[PDB]
Structures are given as structure tokens and as C-alpha cells.
């Protein structure tokens, strides 16, 4: 594999060098021009040798740091957990606020801080690479995937994509808000006294490490638990559905709309069943288009509904691959980075309908779906599809603003957590300064992948489904639509599938949905039955959130320092060293209080005095946690008593006297005035 | 030379010796020198090193209270400290730089413990009282 | 017990392999010092309180046996 990949890469780079002989300024053929563009992009080759090697080194280092990062329980530092096993289980199964908080904070303080400087260098180098390629920044290079030029009407500028996102997002906010409120209302019953009905959700309670999906929250938020979900896996087992006939059923489904049959060698070369322990193979279901009419599917298929839907999705992927077989090699791909996954996913969306399950025989014909079952299914869908949209948009917006330089290098986290609060409605459980690199802890950020693809694909699929449900003449709710036995819908879809990259993606959209740009309305049309119910379920609850409540905001003591007044001239500047000294002083005061009053020896440290909302006035909020137990916060009363006890030493450390160093809640006593005899 | 001495140590060359006299400088109302005071002193020394490395060499080095190694603690409150690199134990900040750092920020260290240059002696860092002004 | 190089905290060494090789083969004063101090500050401090309790309990056991 290494040899073949190196040979292919060398061939591609030498062909790219050769292709420069024909400038695009004189090319008139559209297909030729775009193929030359594909074979003419320099990529990382435009940098110097040293810079290119440094870029490859930092990319590889970030990848390995993400892959092999370990966090360990402070009690048994001999046991440590990776990310993929254990930590994901902790974040997706535990109901302990303390345990989930520990997992979240440990992962973001043991792998975030290692990724901060590497990410800074990565941003600088990638921006240089993009600018050397006549892009204003790296984010512009990423957005360039949607660029369309010279078509007289279908042109789609790079800078337009941003707008087409933001405008679209403005129409999802009414739905998401209600969902947010509902989830919040349901999460207060599982983590009481931790979630405020007026504020945002804590970051670690979202059923996933980053909150990217809300699927694992479903068990805590099911609308009608007493009604079971539609499961036909047992029916498959009873009818003896091996991992050979489900693909046959999916093929029948694809042909029912007019799509062509599978190739003869497709079944022979496939790996539809696990090869056992004798042969080691990957189990991620993947589609392969080896070329020259060679299409294969790899999947460790079991007997489950999830495997059935995954098989349908993969067969959609390979159907798309086969559709543009006639196109030249540089054209053998989807319209953009989002089309392929949307095309694959609409098949899974259609096949999961209870109507199709009844028609295939897995669902008994004597099964009438209740409106409750529809609500449950819709909420399960929304926790995945709608939950990820605000997160995706916020992440991509932050990355674009970082690449463009609109966010200073010393204001990354302060802006990132300021965005999640007012866009996603998610608040950090403990404050993070500029040392942390939370966004780099996600896989797609540290491994240098474009993230906007997951946004548009979410929209496109619905725009497809609705269109394919219009031609099929479906009257009821969209979530019940099925496209089986609809040759017109299949023909309409194939009209776009065969195009591949030969045409602008706008034109491909026009050939299915009849529009030129992405429109979010079908998504809302899909979730309208749920939306109403959500609106009915939030009569008393307060829909929305405030960007001021935080889980640590109740135990915070607010410090305000006035240097220039108390010292006049000869006053030092309040740099980070002074903050270090202040945190050390507070930790010392806490140690003294716990030793001289409660007779307990507690080893506080400067990293246990968490500081937030630093402002130029030198006014911030601090609070002190347990020595190694992040979930444990020393209650404010004890902190106030500790500060009162040793306020003189703190005042002397900074040469301030009780008026320039105000703790806003600790009022000093001047002392009784003695009276003469 | 056959044999050995129980006084040489690999860190003994870069050690700065601190001697603290609480009871003289404060008389009564003098606190006790428990481990919390040692923690505060090490934090103060680390802060001084940070300030020196930021304001003179223009390097941001993240010193910490665990990087100020303390030995030979005695009831007089007289000990030897030396500062290593932020995470590189084999690297010891040479004594000259530590002395310059202490001279630069000795006022803050003195104020932290309410001592004045006579009860907090660094045994090698001699203070300057200041020139006496002369009339016209 | 594991100790890890401060440069690549993702790579960590046990005692029986690696650390013994480092201590018995390296000629770098810095590397050997790192190994020694890391082993004694990552497994010594974890063993202090347990050893105190162990001393107390073993002394009680011996005294109950007329030693
Ligand atoms: C870190 O600090 C937190 C406190 O903020 C500790 O959580 C506390 O753990 C104890 C021990 O499990 C809990 O007591 C138990 O409560 C459950 C709940 O019903 C009960 O079934 C048990 O019988 C026992 O009473 C306590 O409630 C809990 N406090 C909070 C606020 O969650 C945590 O243990 C500390 N971590 C470590 C490693 O010590
Ligand atoms: C921790 O600090 C020590 C210094 O106390 C660092 O050791 C130093 O490492 C550099 C880099 O290898 C050495 O320079 C090299 O010296 C060898 C010896 O001949 C030479 O072959 C090389 O060309 C280069 O000049 C330096 O001598 C050495 N200093 C000492 C006192 O050993 C160590 O690298 C630091 N650790 C980390 C992780 O940075
Ligand atoms: C742009 O070039 C392509 C590639 O030649 C043209 O498409 C056809 O490609 C086949 C196979 O390469 C040739 O045998 C044909 O002669 C090409 N032309 C036609 C009309 O079939 C395409 O036509 C060209 N477009 C323009 C506007 O000239
Ligand atoms: C790529 O780099 C070459 C020089 O290495 C330069 O001539 C060319 O303009 C750059 N861009 C393209 C699209 O080839
Ligand atoms: C597809 O192939 C299967 C057997 O491989 C065959 O039974 C079926 O009829 C074919 N499809 C059509 C539309 O003929
Ligand atoms: C289902 O329909 C019944 C009958 O109108 C109604 O009372 C109930 O509220 C509906 N529930 C949902 C979730 O639509
Ligand atoms: C589609 O056509 C097949 C073949 O006639 C039929 O069995 C099935 O009921 C039809 N409807 C659906 C939803 O599959
Ligand atoms: C003010 O009164 C408090 C106790 O009420 C005391 O600790 C404090 O020292 C007094 N302030 C003086 C005497 O300056
Ligand atoms: C003594 O002189 C030094 C420089 O030689 C100076 O930094 C220090 O402040 C002086 N002490 C005073 C003025 O009290
Ligand atoms: Zn896929």
C-alpha cells in the first residue's frame, strides 16, 4: 500500500507540474478547463522545503497526540484511558455529573494544551500556503470547493458560501431553540440542581465528548417511553436473514425506482460477512470504486436494523459511483464534498420508514403507527440531525475567523466559548484561558479536515428527499415518505447522479430540486410535526437561553484591583506573572484556613484557583476547587472566611490596602475607636 | 583521596542560602514557619524568576512552585534553594541569573512576608540603602 | 508504574523494560538523572502513605505476637 500510494502521489505531482504548460486564460472548453484546474492545483508543493517538512511534522504530531492521548483518574494514576475506548463509553453512558465532568476536563487539559502551540504553527503555515496559492487565507481555500466560475448565472463565489450558510442558519434557530429548551427541561430531572432553566446547557452533559451529536441523550429525553421503538431485528432473526439477503433486498429497493442492477463481480468480490479471526480486516463499512467498472463493498455485517440501513447507505454510495462511470477520471466524483453523503443518506432515510418495513415483511401488516411513535422517531432523528447543525456552523465559523486573522492569537478560547454560549447554547463547566485549545480536541480539527461538509450535506439530503417525494406523489407527512416503485423519482435522481463533477453543483441541484442554491425549508418541512409538539410542550418553560449563567457562577468571588489609584506612579503592570502570584496567594490563604481551623492538611495549588472574566480594570471572578477533584468546588462561605483570615498577607503581597483590592462581599473592619478614661 | 565527605552534593554549587529571622523583625504577632509559608516562599521565588525571564531576556518560561528545590531546612529558618528548568530536571538555572532575578524583585518578596532586607538575607545578595542626597 | 518523557508525554516507560535499559546502558548524565528522579517522584510519592500505614499495621501485628 505504501509503495502504490507513493507511486500514485509522484505521478500526480509530476502531472501537476506538467499541466502548467496550458494556462486557463486561453482554455475555452469547460470540461478541459476544470480538469486542468484539478490537475494544476499546487497544494503544499508551493511552500519551501523547510516549511513543507515542518508542516508535515506538525500535522503528524497532532494526529498522533489525538490518537494516543491518555487521561488518568487522579485516585489510581496507574490506570489510564484512551479516547476511543473507555472515555467515549464514560461520556456516552455515565449519569454521574462528577465523573463526566472529570472526563471532559481531563481530556481538554491533557490533550488540548499539548495541541495549542502546534495548532498555532499549523494556522500560520497553512495560511502561508494558501496565500502563496492566491487565496486570501486557508479558509478561503477550504471554501473553494464550492466555487463555480464562467457559467453565466450558475457562478457561485467562495465568499457567498458564508452568507448562504448564515442566512440559512437564521431559519433553523426557531426550531433548535425549542429543542434546546425541551432537552434542558428533560435534563433537569436527571441532573437536578446543576442545570438552570434560564441558562445554557453544561458542555459535558450532552451525551458526547464534544456535544457534536445529541444521540446518546435520547434515553434521558424520550417523549413517550412507554411506547417501544420500531425494531425488526428480531423479525429478521426469525426469518433467518443472513448477511447475504439484506443486500439483495437493498438491490431490489434500488431497482424499484429504476436504478440499474449490481455488477456480476460485485457479489463475488464483496466482503459482506466478517471473515472471522482467521483473516484480519477492517470493519468500517466502506465503498470501493477501484475503476474500470470495479465496485465493491466492505462491511462486517451482522443481523440488525442498523446494519440494514448502513447497507442501504453504502449501496447508495456505490450507485452514485457507478452513475458517473462514463465520466473522465478527474470527473469521477460527486458534485462537491457534500453530495455523496447526502445521496447515500437519503436511501437510509427512506428505508427506515415503517411503510417500507411493512411492505418488505419485517413489520407485521397488523401494525398501525401512533402519532406518539412518530413523535418518538422524529425526536430521535432530530437529536442527531438538528443537534449537530449549530455545532457544525459554530465550529466552522470559528475556524474561518481564526484563519482570516479576525481573532487575535491571544483571544482564541475567550472568543470560542463566547460563540458556543450564544449560538449553540452550551456553557463550559469550568473556565478555560488561552492555554487550552478545546477546538483542537475534536478529530476533524486536529487532523486538518474541512468541517462545513457536514452542514450542507444535512440540508441537501432533505432538499433531495422532498423533491423525490414530489415526483413520487406522496401526500402525507414527509417523514413517512417512501420512494419505492417510483420510476420518475429514480430518473430525476439519476439525471443528477450521472453528471458527477462534469457540471457545476448548482446545476446538479437544479436538476433535482429545481433550485440553484441550498434552501433549509425542506428540513423544517421534515420536522414540522415535531416542531408543533415541541411548541406545545414548552408552554411553561422559558424558551431560549442567557449568555451569562455558568455552572461555576454561584461560588465565584469577584476581585477588583485598582493599582494606579493606590500606588499612583511606580505602579507595576498586571501581566500573567501577577496573576500567578495572586493565585498562589489565594491557594496559600486556603491552605492556612484549612490547617488552622479545620485541622486538615489540604495541598492546594496555583492551578486550583480558577480565574474567569479577566478584564482591563483588573476585575475577575475566581473560585477554588478541591486539590485534585475538579467536580468538588469549595463553597463560597469557606472561601470568604479563608480570605478574611489571611487578607492582610494578600494585601501586603501586592502593596494594596483593602480599598484597591476589593473582594466584593468581604467588607473589612477598620477597628473600634478607643475612648479615653 | 580515599574516602568521602558528607557535605558535597551535585546541587551544592548553584544553591542560594536563605536565612529568615521572623521573631526579630516582627517581635510579637509573628507567624509560625509551617509548610504553607514554604509554599508561599517557593511561589514567590518562581514569580521572581518568571519576571526576570520575561522583562530581561524576553522569554516566557513557565516556572512553578515545584521548580524551586529546597534543602537543608533548619529551625533557624535557614535553607538552600535552587531553581531548575520548567520541566527539565537536569537543567539548573545558573546561580548568577538567580541572583539577578532576586535582586530585581526582592522588594516584592520582602513585602510578601513583611520582612525588610535584614531578616530575609540571601547570603550573597547585598542590598543598597540608597545614596544620601546632599543639599545645594 | 509509568514515567513519561516531558517532551512526548504520549510515550511512557515501565520499570522492567526500558527504564532498566536506560539506567544500565545510557551514558548521558541528563537522561539518567531524568530516569532516576522521574521514577522516584512518580512511584515514591504514591508509595509514601501506603508505606506509613503498612509500618503501623505490621508493627501492631508483631507486637500482638509478643515481638
Ligand atoms: C469529588 O467531590 C465530589 C463532591 O463534589 C464527590 O462526590 C460525592 O461522592 C460521595 C461518595 O459517593 C457522595 O455520597 C454518596 O451519595 C450517593 C447519592 O445518593 C449515595 O448513594 C451514597 O450513599 C453517598 O451518600 C456525594 O453525594 C457526592 N457529592 C456530589 C455533590 O456529587 C466525589 O466523590 C469526589 N471525588 C473523589 C475522587 O473523592
Ligand atoms: C535539559 O537541559 C540540558 C542542559 O543542562 C540539556 O542538555 C544539553 O543538550 C544539548 C543538545 O544535545 C547539548 O548540546 C550538544 O552537546 C553535544 C555534546 O558534545 C554535542 O555533540 C551537540 O552537537 C550539541 O552541542 C548540551 O551540551 C547539553 N548540555 C548539558 C549540560 O548536558 C538538555 O537537552 C535539556 N533537555 C531537553 C529535553 O531540552
Ligand atoms: C471538451 O472536450 C471533451 C473531450 O474531448 C469533448 O467531449 C467529447 O469527448 C470524446 C472523448 O474524449 C471525443 O471523442 C469527442 O470528440 C468530444 N466531443 C464531443 C462533441 O463528443 C467536449 O465535446 C468538448 N467540449 C467543447 C465545448 O468543445
Ligand atoms: C504553482 O507553482 C508554480 C511554481 O512552482 C507556479 O509557476 C504556478 O503559477 C503555481 N500555480 C499553479 C496553479 O500551477
Ligand atoms: C438483477 O439481478 C438479479 C440476479 O442477480 C435478477 O434476479 C434480477 O432480475 C435483476 N434485475 C432485473 C431488473 O432484472
Ligand atoms: C395523538 O392523537 C390524539 C387524538 O387526537 C391526541 O389526543 C394526542 O394528543 C396526539 N398525540 C400526539 C403526540 O400527537
Ligand atoms: C412495490 O412493488 C412491489 C412489486 O410489485 C410490491 O410487492 C410492493 O408492495 C410495492 N410497494 C412497496 C412500497 O414496495
Ligand atoms: C475589625 O474587626 C474584625 C473582627 O470583627 C477584626 O478581625 C479586624 O482586625 C478589625 N480591624 C482592625 C482592628 O483594624
Ligand atoms: C541601591 O542601589 C541599587 C543599584 O546600585 C538600586 O537598585 C537600589 O534601589 C538602591 N537602594 C535604594 C535606593 O534604597
Ligand atoms: Zn458514507
Numbering used by the authors:
A (entry chain A): 62 to 738
B (entry chain B): 603 to 738
C (entry chain B): 130 to 196
Give the text the authors published on this PDB structure.
Several plasma membrane transporters import proline into the cell, including the Sodium/imino-acid transporter 1 (SIT1) encoded by the SLC6A20 gene. SIT1 belongs to the SLC6 gene family of amino acid and amine transporters, and the larger Neurotransmitter Sodium Symporter (NSS) superfamily. SIT1 adopts the classic LeuT-fold expected for this family of amino acid transporters, while ACE2 is composed of peptidase (PD) domain and collectrin-like domain with transmembrane and neck regions. As with the homologous ACE2-B0AT1 complex, the structure is a dimer of heterodimers where homodimerization of ACE2 is mediated primarily by its neck domain while the ACE2 and transporter subunits interact via three distinct sets of contacts.
Single-particle cryo-EM analysis ultimately yielded a nominal 3.24 Å map of the ACE2-SIT1 complex, determined in the presence of pipecolate. This map was sufficiently detailed to model residues 10–582 of SIT1 and 21–768 of ACE2. While the 2:2 ACE2-SIT1 complex with the peptidase domain in the closed conformation yielded the highest-resolution map for the entire complex, the map is best in ACE2’s neck region and less detailed in the transporter. Further classifying the 2:2 ACE2-SIT1 complex data, there are two distinct conformations based on the relative domain orientations within the ACE2 dimer. This movement between open and closed conformations occurs as a 30° rigid-body rotation around a hinge at residues 612-617 in the loop between peptidase and collectrin-like domains. As with the ACE2-B0AT1 structure, a second dimer interface is formed by Gln139 and Gln175 within the peptidase domain in ACE2’s closed conformation. SIT1 is in an occluded conformation with the active site inaccessible to both the cytoplasm and extracellular space. Within the SIT1 binding site are two non-protein densities, identified as pipecolate and chloride based on size, local chemistry, and similarity to structures of other LeuT-fold transporters.
